[PDB]
Amino acid sequence: PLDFTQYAKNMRKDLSNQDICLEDGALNHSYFLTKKGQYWTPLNQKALQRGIELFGVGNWKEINYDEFSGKANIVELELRTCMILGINDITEYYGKKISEEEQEEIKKSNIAKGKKENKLKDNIYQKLQ
Amino acid sequence: LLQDIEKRILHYKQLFFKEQNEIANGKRSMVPDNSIPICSDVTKLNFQALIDAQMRHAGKMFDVIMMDPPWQAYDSLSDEKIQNMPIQSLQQDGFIFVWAINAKYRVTIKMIENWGYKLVDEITWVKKTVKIAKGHGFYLQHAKESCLIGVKGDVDNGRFKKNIASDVIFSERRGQSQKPEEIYQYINQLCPNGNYLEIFARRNNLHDNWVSIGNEL
C-alpha cells in the first residue's frame, strides 16, 4: 500500500542531478548506459551543432575551446558530427562550416540516398572507399 | 597494417552509431526503474533534504541502511568524517548494515553503538573459488569479510520478519569489489517492501525501492 514508483519520482526530482532524471521525474537510462562523467547532455549537443556553424567541421581544437570548455573527447566530437550529417565518413565535409539549417538538410539528404542505395545502417549512410 | 587498422575503425564507429541509436529508441538501463540514485559526497551532502523528502513522500523513515565506508570502499575519507555523519537522524526504528574490513572491525562496532545501535548479528561472506579465499591476513589469512548489523527501536512490528535469513553468504566476487547480490535478498526476508537506504553506493548495486548515494552515481 505504497507506490514505490511514484515515491521514486518526487525524490528523484529534488534529490537527483538534472542529468539523472527526466522533468517528469522518471529516470533517464541514457545517463546510466554511458560511463559516469562522460554523459553527453542535450544542451551540449546543441553546442556541437552550434560549433560546426561557427567554426566548421574538423575545427575541433578551435571549436573545442568555445563550446566545450575542457571539454570532451576530440574523437567523440567527430563521431557525433558523423551523426549530425548522417554519413559515416565525414571526410567529405571537412573544414566547411555548416549552418544548423544545412546540417539538417545534409543529414536528410544523405540518409535518403543511403536508403535507396541500400547502404544505410543504423540510420547512418555508409560510404564507399 | 594500415588497411586492417583502417578496417577496425569503421567497424568500431558503427557500434557507437548503433548504440547511440537504440538509446534514442528507448533502450533500457541495467538499473531497475524503481531505484533512486543520487550523486553527492556525503561530506558535502545535507541530509536534511533527504529527510524532508522521505518524510514527505513516505511519512516514514528508513527500514534499513547499508554501508561500505571508504576507510583510509577505498575513497579515503577521514575516519572521523565517516564517524561523524548524522546517521541517527536518517532512521528511527530499524536495522543497519555495515561492512567492516578486518582492520576496522572493532572501530566499526564502536561506530554503530555511537549512532545508538545494538549489535545483534554479523553476516559472513565467503569467497568460494568455484571454493576458498586467499587473503593476506595479518595473523590469520582471511577468507571472508563480514557485515555488522545493529538495531534500534521496535522491530516487534509486522514488517520485519524474524528468522527469515541466514548469517552466512556463499557468492563469487563478481565485478570486484562487489558485494554479494544475495544481501538484497536477505534484506527482503528481513524487510519486505520496505524503504531502504544505502550509502557510499556503487552504480552496479542499485535496486528497486532503494535510495542510493555515492559520488560515482
Side-chain angles (χ1 to χ4, degrees), chain A residues 79 82-83 85-89 107 110-127, chain B residues 8-11 13-22 25:
Chain A
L79 241 33
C82 278
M83 263 160 33
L85 297 158
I87 203 180
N88 83 346
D89 237 289
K107 155 150 235 207
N110 267 2
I111 308 192
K113 155 217 239 142
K115 169 165 151 322
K116 317 179 196 331
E117 320 219 321
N118 250 53
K119 283 202 312 236
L120 170 128
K121 260 207 274 196
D122 291 305
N123 250 220
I124 275 34
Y125 168 57
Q126 324 280 163
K127 191 155 127 304
Chain B
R8 332 269 154 187
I9 290 187
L10 280 152
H11 176 297
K13 322 167 78 190
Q14 253 312 319
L15 312 168
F16 181 85
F17 296 149
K18 193 219 229 170
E19 202 208 36
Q20 289 302 288
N21 206 234
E22 328 207 281
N25 292 344

Side-chain angles (χ1 to χ4, degrees), chain B residues 62-67 87 90-91 95-97 197 199:
Chain B
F62 292 97
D63 297 19
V64 171
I65 295 206
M66 268 215 308
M67 222 165 137
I87 275 118
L90 295 196
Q91 93 155 266
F95 288 64
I96 201 191
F97 294 66
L197 205 182
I199 295 166

Side-chain angles (χ1 to χ4, degrees), chain A residues 15 28-29 43 48 50 72 83 85-87 90 109 125 127:
Chain A
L15 295 210
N28 107 84
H29 300 347
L43 184 150
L48 171 54
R50 188 190 318 110
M83 263 160 33
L85 297 158
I87 203 180
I90 179 194
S109 163
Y125 168 57
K127 191 155 127 304

Side-chain angles (χ1 to χ4, degrees), chain B residues 82-99:
Chain B
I82 311 200
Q83 98 178 39
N84 293 332
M85 263 179 52
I87 275 118
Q88 21 233 347
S89 85
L90 295 196
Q91 93 155 266
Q92 344 269 317
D93 223 280
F95 288 64
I96 201 191
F97 294 66
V98 80
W99 288 89

Side-chain angles (χ1 to χ4, degrees), chain A residues 10 12 29 31-32 80, chain B residues 20 29 33 57 203 217:
Chain A
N10 308 248
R12 275 200 215 98
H29 300 347
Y31 175 92
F32 278 144
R80 298 255 200 224
Chain B
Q20 289 302 288
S29 207
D33 262 282
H57 298 103
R203 273 246 196 115
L217 309 218

Side-chain angles (χ1 to χ4, degrees), chain B residues 68-73 75-127 129 133-146:
Chain B
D68 206 337
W71 298 107
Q72 260 174 36
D75 288 345
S76 67
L77 241 195
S78 168
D79 310 302
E80 283 98 66
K81 296 246 210 119
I82 311 200
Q83 98 178 39
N84 293 332
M85 263 179 52
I87 275 118
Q88 21 233 347
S89 85
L90 295 196
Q91 93 155 266
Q92 344 269 317
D93 223 280
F95 288 64
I96 201 191
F97 294 66
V98 80
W99 288 89
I101 34 162
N102 182 181
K104 312 308 285 168
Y105 186 88
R106 185 59 170 98
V107 159
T108 298
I109 293 288
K110 201 204 157 127
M111 228 197 227
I112 76 191
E113 282 180 285
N114 251 290
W115 288 330
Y117 294 78
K118 195 192 116 39
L119 228 290
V120 62
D121 229 315
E122 194 214 333
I123 291 317
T124 299
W125 179 29
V126 279
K127 293 164 245 156
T129 299
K134 333 210 219 29
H136 175 310
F138 208 98
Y139 292 118
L140 281 204
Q141 292 168 16
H142 322 284
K144 37 71 155 175
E145 322 110 340
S146 34

Side-chain angles (χ1 to χ4, degrees), chain A residues 12-17 19-22 24-35 37-60 62-124:
Chain A
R12 275 200 215 98
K13 293 179 179 179
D14 320 319
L15 295 210
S16 325
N17 305 35
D19 289 357
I20 302 196
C21 83
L22 313 155
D24 24 332
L27 79 134
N28 107 84
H29 300 347
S30 295
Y31 175 92
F32 278 144
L33 285 141
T34 307
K35 261 179 99 171
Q38 294 300 320
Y39 185 57
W40 175 278
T41 168
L43 184 150
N44 65 332
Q45 162 110 10
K46 256 119 83 190
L48 171 54
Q49 308 176 140
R50 188 190 318 110
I52 312 181
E53 168 147 353
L54 299 159
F55 314 102
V57 200
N59 209 328
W60 325 112
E62 152 101 90
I63 179 208
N64 190 336
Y65 184 51
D66 279 46
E67 247 95 19
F68 299 95
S69 342
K71 188 290 169 178
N73 289 337
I74 170 155
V75 175
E76 178 172 49
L77 301 204
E78 86 143 329
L79 241 33
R80 298 255 200 224
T81 321
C82 278
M83 263 160 33
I84 291 176
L85 297 158
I87 203 180
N88 83 346
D89 237 289
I90 179 194
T91 85
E92 154 189 356
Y93 301 106
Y94 265 100
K96 276 188 211 181
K97 59 198 204 215
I98 299 150
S99 59
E100 293 210 48
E101 278 77 345
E102 189 181 359
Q103 317 173 17
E104 241 130 64
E105 189 260 306
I106 300 193
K107 155 150 235 207
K108 250 166 194 118
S109 163
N110 267 2
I111 308 192
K113 155 217 239 142
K115 169 165 151 322
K116 317 179 196 331
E117 320 219 321
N118 250 53
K119 283 202 312 236
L120 170 128
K121 260 207 274 196
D122 291 305
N123 250 220
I124 275 34

